[model samples]
Target: HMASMKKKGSVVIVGRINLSGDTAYAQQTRGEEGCQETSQTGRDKNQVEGEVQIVSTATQTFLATSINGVLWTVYHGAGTRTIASPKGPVTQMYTNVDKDLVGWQAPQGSRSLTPCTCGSSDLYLVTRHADVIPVRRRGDSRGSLLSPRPISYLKGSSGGPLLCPAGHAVGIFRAAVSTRGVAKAVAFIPVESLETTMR
Candidate 1:
């Protein structure tokens, strides 16, 4: 029984992932009660191409990682300029404000530097349901190959942290797969691939 809204989802801001706020997004943000306003609503009319807003519509789920002081989220071509959308071109926005508002934050402090391996003796999948589901490598693929679990119905719980025993993350969740349709395993993107994407 999950509240549909509490589901961890991405709030698409209007720029690329970085440490600080995307001024392009801030400049365009409506900052109203709904955070859905545009300059046309009688505010700073600096001008714009697409509607400036926090798009919390996508379900792909963006995972956050910070380098130095800059925070980064997956630019997985979701709700972005890369894809032609009816609203307009899309972009990434990074900030601390919406994090708490959205009930989440990026992993912080010394944990950020924690080195990880998929074959660690203990591995866990941290789900949006606030449960640590045990998982393992499929033993078939090297990276992102294995994350098996008992049958589950945690739909759209992907894009979460694949944590090690020490509470450090080792991978990014991809999806839950089942032989037929019910979920039997939660696949994940290994830390190596995540590191490569971050570079």
Candidate 2:
């Protein structure tokens, strides 16, 4: 768990995602520096917030949320702008920042492999602010499909890195299944599949 948190701190950039009037707490494929803060708790300040930029797409950023069964796209730009919000129109600035991208693991083979056996206490879900929670791998789909073992309320954690033990981002959190207000199964798009989409 300590190791996982360390990895998350270095690679994760937690933030809110707004697309088409639908919002979900979100993470990113990669992050950029030069933002004023990692997180902001103010109610109406126009302070800078962490920006999730697409290093590969060049002025095009990608993020998605299963909360509404949708994917979101945003164009990269600079300058101050007013974003409509529940509180009111909020202003923010987009600044130049340094890129930090995570490395991807190679795709696995097609042959059936043994289950990813581990102690029930061994696996965990680390969310925003470095809160770690226990989870079970349960089962998978098409070999690459992973998660769905008592995932909790991680509202804004979609699109965050699904890292391996070695810190390589194998996938991005896509969606979750909830019952009784608790998330049971969380799904993600493997990096291999993402590569196909990028093409």
Candidate 3:
């Protein structure tokens, strides 16, 4: 719930994640700089290399992870806002817990043992609702597979967008699962729900 008002056109760089190594060292080098980590997801190298859109509105600005261990937002006026930090994006922003997005939680016993559906055990995405439309993979010949399985984990895919067929952003990558099949899931926070928070 950090808020600050400034003249328009101020260059505000929000720290999306925890500063590490030299960046952390540099922050310490500066005396009492207002450099705090926020809880935002990271971006893939490819996305960083291409065009990216910053989520901004008349009253607030949002930046997903640009660093590690941080989530950040900037507001133009002083207002009470609630910022939730959960253990993971799937647990915190998406799934049945929030009610803003429909999501599937790991089954009770399987929660601790079954590999994450997002491929990476740790990776997650923020989603809006749990209601999902069933679709088949583009080239599946068997046709027995009726739904999209939870994403399996992959390396170097952090901050990647989990997009629906319509090209709307649904979630972001967070971590990976370690197993034989390497079953993984990407934690995503709902962009639609996030938009509701902006104003």
Measured by TM-score, how close is model 3 to the native structure? 0.26
Ranking under lDDT, best-scoring first?
A: 1, 2, 3
lDDT of 2 at 44: 25
Tens digit of per-residue lDDT, candidate 2, span 61-146 = 23321211112111121112222222333332221212111222111211111112232212334444233444444443111223
Which scores greater on TM-score, model 1 or model 3?
1
What C-alpha lDDT values do all the predictions have? Answer: 0.38, 0.31, 0.26
Count backbone clashes in candidate 3. Answer: 52
Better of 1 and 2 by TM-score: 1
Give the range where candidate 1 is weakest over 10 consecutive residues by summed lDDT. 95-104
Judged by TM-score, which candidate is best? 1
**What lDDT does candidate 3 reach at residue 12?**
21
| Predicted candidate 1 versus true structure: per-residue lDDT over 1-199, tens digit per residue | 5566442222433221111232221122223332233211212222212211122233343333332222333334232212112243223333222221111122222124243754574566544344556766553212221444444545434444566676555665555567665565655655555445434
Looking at model 2, the pairs that clash are 25-156, 148-185
Which residue pairs clash within candidate 1? Answer: 15-92, 19-70, 19-71, 81-90, 138-146
Could you tell me which 10 consecutive residues in candidate 2 have the lowest summed lDDT?
105-114
Q: Candidate 2, 178: how far from true, in Å? A: 0.8
> What order do you get sorting by TM-score, best first?
1, 2, 3
Off by over 4 Å in 2: 1-125, 132-152
Cα misplacement distance, residue 116 of candidate 1 (Å): 1.4
